[PDB]
Amino acid sequence: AIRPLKLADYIGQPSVREQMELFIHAARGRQEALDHTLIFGPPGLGKTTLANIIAQEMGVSIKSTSGPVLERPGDLAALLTNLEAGDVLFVDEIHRLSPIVEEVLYPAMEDFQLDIMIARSIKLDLPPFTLVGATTRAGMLTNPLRDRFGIVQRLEFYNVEDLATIVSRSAGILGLEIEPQGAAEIAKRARGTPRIANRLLRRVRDFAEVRGQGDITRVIADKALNLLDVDERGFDHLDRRLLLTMIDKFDGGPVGIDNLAAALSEERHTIEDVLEPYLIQQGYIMRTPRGRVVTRHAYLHFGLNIPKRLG
Numbered sequence: 001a002i003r004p005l006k007l008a009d010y011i012g013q014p015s016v017r018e019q020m021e022l023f024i025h026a027a028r029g030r031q032e033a034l035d036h037t038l039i040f041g042p043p044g045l046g047k048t049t050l051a052n053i054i055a056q057e058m059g060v061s062i063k064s065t066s067g068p069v070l071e072r073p074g075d076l077a078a079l080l081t082n083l084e085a086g087d088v089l090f091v092d093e094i095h096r097l098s099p100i101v102e103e104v105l106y107p108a109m110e111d112f113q114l115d116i117m118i119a120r121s122i123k124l125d126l127p128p129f130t131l132v133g134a135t136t137r138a139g140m141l142t143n144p145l146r147d148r149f150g151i152v153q154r155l156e157f158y159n160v161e162d163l164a165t166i167v168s169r170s171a172g173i174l175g176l177e178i179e180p181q182g183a184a185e186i187a188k189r190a191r192g193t194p195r196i197a198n199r200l201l202r203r204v205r206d207f208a209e210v211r212g213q214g215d216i217t218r219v220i221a222d223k224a225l226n227l228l229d230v231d232e233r234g235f236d237h238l239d240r241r242l243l244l245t246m247i248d249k250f251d252g253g254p255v256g257i258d259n260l261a262a263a264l265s266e267e268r269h270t271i272e273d274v275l276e277p278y279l280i281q282q283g284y285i286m287r288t289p290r291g292r293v294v295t296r297h298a299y300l301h302f303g304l305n306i307p308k309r310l311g
């Protein structure tokens with residue numbers, strides 16, 4: 001209900017919205033498939049949502065898959081051969097395609113031709129289609145794959161004013177009364193993401209209905225977020241454990257990503273793709289050639305003294 005199904009409802013990414021509206025209206029005007037589109041940025045920013053909007057606005061079907069799911073060239077082939085003219089094939093986590101599966105994608109995208117080995121090479125014609133790929137950052141794709149995308153959109157963390165607009169819109173859809181400052185409190189602590197802002201709104205609604213009067217106020221939002229263990233900066237338990245581990249076990253860094261992951265019992269990709277991007281963006285962590293380091297702001301956040309020493 002609250003997820004935008006069309007570009008008109010896509011708030012907080014004006015450049016992306018304006019560009020996509022233009023490219024889609026142009027492709028439809030020519031009765032052609034939209035050019036292959038790459039969407040990148042952090043998780044929860046609406047990559048899957050945008051992919052679905054593309055299919056919706058184009059008036060076509062969307063087939064969704066993921067880089068890890070396509071273990072063999074034939075798995076990709078099966079999807080490609082099942083598309084109708086103009087359909088969207090959405091491949092989330094596209095940077096995790098195995099090098100050999102990625103090879104099949106090159107002619108499928110560029111020439112609408114399937115070229116697969118079975119030994120014998122088989123060449124088959126494909127109907128026009130749109131590949132929508134998503135990854136956390138564009139630089140982690142090869143140059144050949146990257147260069148086959150005709151449209152490239154970059155999603156960035158949302159500013160707090162736009163997140164508040166999104167929270168207020170969602171509250172309206174849910175029939176909830178919300179004060180401006182209530183929407184602001186949630187937006188402030190939503191970690192720059194509409195996914196999180198919307199989830200937090202649902203949990204705040206619960207608190208309002210059970211412990212309050214049913215409406216969303218700044219005080220109700222604050223108490224509810226405190227119960228959820230989400231702090232004033234939008235940091236959750238894992239975010240704080242990451243920063244505190246860097247401070248306590250590694251003296252603030254520098255610490256290599258593998259050492260940090262092992263110290264947290266978390267995988268590398270989790271720290272790099274899920275935890276770190278917002279923390280770096282907000283100025284709490286910095287990457288250096290010798291490893292990640294916390295900034296003085298990490299110490300200040302926890303009421304700790306800033307150490308003064310040499311590097």
Ligand SMILES: Nc1ncnc2c1ncn2[C@@H]1O[C@H](COP(=O)(O)OP(=O)(O)O)[C@@H](O)[C@H]1O
Nearest residue numbers: 002003010011043044045046047048049194195
């Ligand atoms: N521009 C936007 N405006 C309002 N809500 C959004 C926007 N982008 C995403 N959302 C919301 O955030 C959620 C996350 O979208 P999703 O496509 O799953 O992100 P990703 O695929 O990047 O992890 C969606 O369920 C949707 O409700």
